Design a protein around this ligand. Structure first.
Ligand SMILES: CCCCCCCCCCCCCC(=O)SCCNC(=O)CCNC(=O)[C@H](O)C(C)(C)COP(=O)(O)OP(=O)(O)OC[C@H]1O[C@@H](n2cnc3c(N)ncnc32)[C@H](O)[C@@H]1OP(=O)(O)O
Ligand SMILES: [Mg+2]
Length: 411
């Protein structure tokens, strides 16, 4: 059933997953010296290319590949259109490794055919709380604690094969080469997400959406007018009223984050993320990188009153190409990123996220049911969407956890 995934160090079934009780490696690691120095073999007419994702023309080349060939819905109405600025941001965090950005080009015509990217992440990925209790109940605490310390691993994203090259087994070649480059830096796990089901997730969450411009969403067929609204004389007017938001934020002291806020935002975020079983650890440089505002890309606000930052939220932008509509070309989506609340309830903080995103021209706000995102879904009028975001590890046995135990936002 899986000619590639059955050869890799990942749990193969839910039955196998059910038996895993401690975090730890699937394959005990070899060493860097065991790993082939040369690139994996590839057809003599293709070639490996490492783009420089800080050089505007290489970022452009990868942007076009994704624009035209990255994730689309099944009805081919929308295709992700991650921006050049977003790609530089996402792919070049502190201490990134350029050789983890892996592309394939056609030699003749130098056509870009495929891409995959890895970035460093420091991840807490030790045995989860409910399995540590089960280990205590049986006298197995030290085996359960072995990998408690945060681990320096790879996060994988942006796997893409050109539409003309689909179903030719090029994705396993990209994955094997990326795994070799990561292993040659002495890293032996990765984390990745996908909307598709592969062997075998350690967590799964539904997607949720909050309409900000319902008229546009219905015009482009992202949304429909729900049947309940047909009993009104003006169904669209009532749908707009249902989703209407204030025109300015309600929390006193909300302002954009600035460099001087990095230590306090790091402290409150890390204290909050500690409560989840799987979650990132960020240095001050990584809090700067992932959270300071960047036009068009990431938007972050703090609540500061009386000279103290007590709360913050962030969101990032990913537009989608709208294929074939004579009134709009783009779906402008805001995605809930990290946040922490110490002075106000989460729904009160996140209401200001929706207000700011709507004021800035976003059409919808999206998130998955990770972190404490379930705690504000009803009041803030999120609804579950179709499908599910699955979280995976490469070369890590992990007991299944609920998505409310996941604190890693995947871009
Ligand atoms: C230690 C370091 C480790 C580093 C690596 C860690 C692992 C990272 C893994 C990557 C994490 C990526 C995270 C993201 O970026 S998820 C976003 C993935 N990208 C897209 O959906 C964009 C549009 N689609 C495409 O570009 C292609 O359809 C892709 C590239 C997805 C497959 O190309 P194609 O359709 O031409 O097929 P093939 O003949 O070449 O290959 C067929 C094989 O590929 C397996 N497949 C299909 N979809 C995925 C998928 N999303 N993750 C993993 N595997 C996938 C499939 O089950 C089959 O294997 P098997 O079933 O036969 O066994
Ligand atoms: Mg292929």
């Amino acid at each position: 059933a899986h000619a590639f995934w059955s050869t890799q160090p990942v749990p193969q079934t839910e039955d196998e997953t059910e038996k895993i009780v401690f975090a730890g490696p699937m394959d005990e690691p070899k060493t860097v010296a065991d790993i082939p120095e040369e690139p994996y073999p590839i057809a003599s007419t293709f070639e490996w290319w490492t783009p420089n994702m800080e050089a505007a023309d290489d970022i452009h080349a990868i942007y076009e590949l994704l624009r035209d060939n990255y994730v689309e819905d099944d009805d081919s109405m929308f295709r992700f259109n991650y921006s050049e600025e977003f790609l530089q941001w996402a792919l070049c965090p502190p201490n990134y490794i350029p050789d983890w950005h892996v592309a394939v080009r056609r030699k003749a015509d130098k056509k870009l055919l495929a891409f995959i990217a890895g970035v460093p992440v420091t991840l807490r990925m030790g045995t989860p709380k409910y399995m540590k209790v089960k280990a205590q109940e049986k006298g197995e605490g030290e085996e359960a604690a072995k990998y408690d310390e945060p681990r320096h691993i790879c996060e994988i994203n942006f796997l893409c094969v050109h539409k003309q090259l689909r179903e030719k087994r090029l994705a396993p070649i990209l994955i094997k080469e990326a795994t070799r480059r990561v292993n040659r830096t002495n890293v032996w796990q990765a984390v990745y997400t996908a909307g598709v089901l592969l062997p075998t997730p350690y967590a799964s969450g539904q997607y949720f959406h909050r309409s900000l411009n319902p008229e546009k969403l219905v015009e482009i067929r992202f949304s429909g007018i729900p049947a309940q609204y047909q009993k009104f004389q003006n169904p669209m007017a009532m749908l707009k009223r249902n989703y209407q938001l204030p025109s300015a934020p309600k929390n006193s002291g909300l302002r954009e984050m600035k460099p001087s806020d990095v230590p306090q935002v790091r402290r409150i975020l890390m204290n909050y993320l500690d409560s989840f079983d799987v979650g990132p650890v960020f240095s001050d440089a990584e809090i700067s990188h992932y959270l300071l505002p960047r036009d068009g890309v990431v938007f972050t606000y703090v609540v500061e009153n009386d000279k103290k930052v007590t709360d913050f939220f962030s969101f990032y932008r990913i537009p989608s190409t709208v294929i074939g509509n004579s009134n709009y070309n783009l779906l402008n989506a805001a995605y809930v990123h990290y946040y922490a609340a110490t002075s106000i309830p989460l729904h009160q903080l996140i209401l200001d996220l929706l207000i700011v995103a709507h004021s800035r021209g976003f059409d919808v706000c999206n998130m998955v049911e990770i972190l404490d995102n379930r705690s504000f879904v009803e009041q803030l009028k999120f609804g579950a969407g179709d499908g599910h975001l699955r979280y995976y590890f490469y070369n890590w046995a992990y007991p299944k956890i609920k998505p409310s135990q996941v604190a890693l936002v995947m871009l």
